[PDB]
Every structure is written in structure tokens, then in C-alpha cells.
Amino acid sequence: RRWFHPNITGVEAENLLLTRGVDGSFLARPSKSNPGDFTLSVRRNGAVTHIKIQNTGDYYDLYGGEKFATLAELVQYYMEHHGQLKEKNGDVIELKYPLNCADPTSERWFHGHLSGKEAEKLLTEKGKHGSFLVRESQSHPGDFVLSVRTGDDKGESNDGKSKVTHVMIRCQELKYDVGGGERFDSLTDLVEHYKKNPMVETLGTVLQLKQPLNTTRINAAEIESRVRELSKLAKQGFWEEFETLQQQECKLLYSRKEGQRQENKNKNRYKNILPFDHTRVVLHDGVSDYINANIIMPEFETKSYIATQGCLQNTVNDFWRMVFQENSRVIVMTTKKCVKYWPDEYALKEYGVMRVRNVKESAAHDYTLRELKLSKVGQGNTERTVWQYHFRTWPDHGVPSDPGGVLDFLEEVHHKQESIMDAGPVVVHESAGIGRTGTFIVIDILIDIIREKGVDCDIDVPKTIQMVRSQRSGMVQTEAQYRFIYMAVQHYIETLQR
């Protein structure tokens, strides 16, 4: 995600595009004037056009234009649909040349000010073979040091099989080098070069750069201290941790061809917010196999969920086909177009081949529970109860002021799910199925870890979000939702400690 400049003004962006760019050069940056917003700056006809992009709780909104799940999917869309981006007057804005950012402060491997001893401590405790970081030098101001661990062990050791090597990086006229050879435009360029071609020591050791040092995993028992640091005002804040996570989104541009098919286009609440092909729910009840929904598996590729959009008039029947096929017994939803897909209390309705009875509704302060009976018409023996949890106290703007409501809600949802043997994935849906949906699911994943293992366990919020985002685009949308996840997990741990 080199075209994203985290710490530049609009004036700086214009000057950068006018001096180092040409017509078609572009970059993105966070809005300094409206928290959360972003600006896409594009050079056209020797001038710079600015395009406002709102990151709401539900999606990214190119103002006056279309919705997207992430900034990276937005840029990818227009980099491959040249001529689809136009002003209201109709004039085209072409995205041709990403203007690369040199700033490394948002990269997972960049630690800024850090002593050589501390770096060795961190790499010793948390590192394994190929763990690395880049730190400012204290012995050569302005220079940097790449510290990398190599060996066969993992963690603290005394067999000498593992070591930390410190590679000095000179900064000479805004260019970076390791003392010879190529001079790189940025630390990121240097780092990417040695990821592909690791440096070999004179005696043969290959300094493989396999993964950045993890700095975000914490012990759940120490959640308060991390939160207090992230909450400070004057930097290792929620903003910085979230920005670093966002910087990884170009690794999540998985294919979404099925959702792009013409016969499926009108089954999407937003035409550009689509399910990844490799995790989408495939309907095989035959027809049409498509629904805009993804399976979300915890510990993906190392309880499950279906993350999906609110139903459309023309997808209500598909929604119930999915619920039936997947043996889902619990639905989590919010409401704020997406259509009502259940009958009123005591009524029975058919949705295509599926029949649904609303047996009983129960009102709580934070949510309404609907006990639904689902069956396939002509086959009364297929009946099963689907418990629909309609969360009611999520504010129209931002996140709940106290996570207690969500937590008690998810606790009840968890117990309902756990009481039904062999129940399928919990279905979570609202709006586009990524914002609140991802927030609910990530909270539930993290809480479930603490359920099994207790307060003395490791949790990693951004790594968990990245893992969920590899299964559906843009899960967890905003820094407010990110902070809310931490607040919810903190509240949950404190509840258990007391």
C-alpha cells in the first residue's frame, strides 16, 4: 500500500504530485480535517483533483459516487476500470501511477526509537527465526538498524542455536543503503529488497526476513495497561495501531469473480462490496449458488460464523436457503435497501421453498429475540428453531458508549448456540455485512479465546482482525469500532477478574 501517505497535508500532497508525479499519478491520505475520512489526490491536466472518501461504520463512501469495502479495493477497482471514475460533470479522472510514500512509521517492522539491547530483548522473548525490525540508530543519528533473529529455536533460549544480527542502514540524502550497492528511496524499498534477496553473512548465515516482530499480541490479564497506553493523548495510540493494520489491506485483495457475474450483480446490497470467492457461502441445494456471504472461521489457516449483508427483496429466499443448508440456528442482526425477512409474531410465511413461523418474540432492553421455526415446504420433518437476536441499542452514529450491552448480548447468543448440539455457523448480518458485522464477530472470537483458556492467555486484536479480513472484505471498518473491540474485551476480562 505504497500510495498511502499517512502524515502529509493537502498542500504537501499537491506539491508531491506536481513535482514527483505526472498526469495520472495519485495518492491517498487520511483527512486531517474530518477524522476517519480520506482523500484521493489525483493529478490531471497539470493540476491536482481531490476526491473525498468517507469511512463510515458500514463502508467506504466515495462522496457522490460508489461504496467500497476498503480503500485498497477502491483503488484497485479504478486502477482496473480506467474511465469509471468521473466527476459529476462527467469528466474522467484516471488513476494510472501510484505515487509511493517513503514514510515507514506505519509499517509493522518499524519501531522508531529503540535501543540495540531492547531490540535484542524483544526479538529474544517474542521472536523466532526470521523475525526482524527496523529501528533508529542512537550511535549514528539519522541512520537506522535492521535487527533480525535467525536460528532453529523459537523464544528465549540458551543453546546458542539462535542469534540476533544488527545490520546498519545509512541514511544519505534521503536514500538508504547497508554500506554498499544500491541506495534505496525508502526503508520500505530496502526492506522489500532483502525480503526477496536476503543478505548472506561472510560466514554463510542467510539473514532471512520472514516476518516483522509482533508488537500487538498481549496477555489478556494485562489488557488494562495496553488500553491505557492506547488511550493516551500525547505515539502508540489506537490510531497508530489501527493505521498499521490498515496498511496490511493490500495483502487481502482476493478474487471476487462470482459476485461480479451479471446474474449475481443485483444480489449485492452494494455492487462493489462482494464476498471473496475462496470463502463465500456456496448454495448447493439444487439452482443459483450465490449469496453475498462468507464463512468466517477462527484461526483460519492455522464455533464459526457467516458474515452477510442485510437481505434484499430479491435475496430473502436465498438467505433462508443458506440458513437451512448450513444448519444455522442463531442469527445476530441490527437494522437501520435491506428488507424484513421474517413474519410478525405468531404468523407463518413461505419464502420460496422455505417456511418460517415466528413462534414468539421476547423484548429485552438491548435486543429483541425472535424464536423462528424454519422448515422446507413439503418436508415437515426438517423443522428447526432459528433464534434471531435483533440488537437494538447500537447508535445510528459511532459505537455504543458502553460495551456492556454488546457483551451481555453476545454472552446470551453464545449460550444459545452452545445449547444446540451440531448447530451450524452463527449468522451475523446488517447493512453491507462488514462493519458492525466484523466488530461483533471479532469481539466474539476474542471473548471465546478467553472462555476456553482463561484470563491468562494471549490475544492479538489486529492480527485477529486481519485474519477475519482475509475471509470477508473490510471486516471492522472504523477506528471507533477498533477501539470498541478493545473496550469490550477489557470489560469482559474485568468482569471475570471480579
Numbering used by the authors: 4 to 237, 244 to 295, 301 to 316, 325 to 358, 366 to 527
What does the paper say about this structure?
The full-length, wild-type SHP2 (FL-WT) contains three domains: a protein tyrosine phosphatase domain (PTP) and two preceding Src homology 2 domains (N-SH2 and C-SH2). The binding of a phosphotyrosine peptide to the opposing face of the N-SH2 domain exposes the catalytic cleft to substrate and activates the system. The recently developed inhibitor, SHP099, allosterically closes the protein and deactivates SHP2 by stabilizing the N-SH2/PTP interaction.
To further substantiate the conformational selection binding mechanism, we investigated SHP099 binding to two additional SHP2 mutants that were originally designed as catalytically dead mutants, with the active site C459 changed to either Ser30 or Glu31. Strikingly, SHP099 affinities to all FL-SHP2 forms correlate well to the corresponding equilibria between open and closed states: FL-WT, -E76D, and -C495E are predominantly in the closed conformation with tight affinities for SHP099; FL-E76K and -C459S with predominantly open conformations have much weaker affinities.
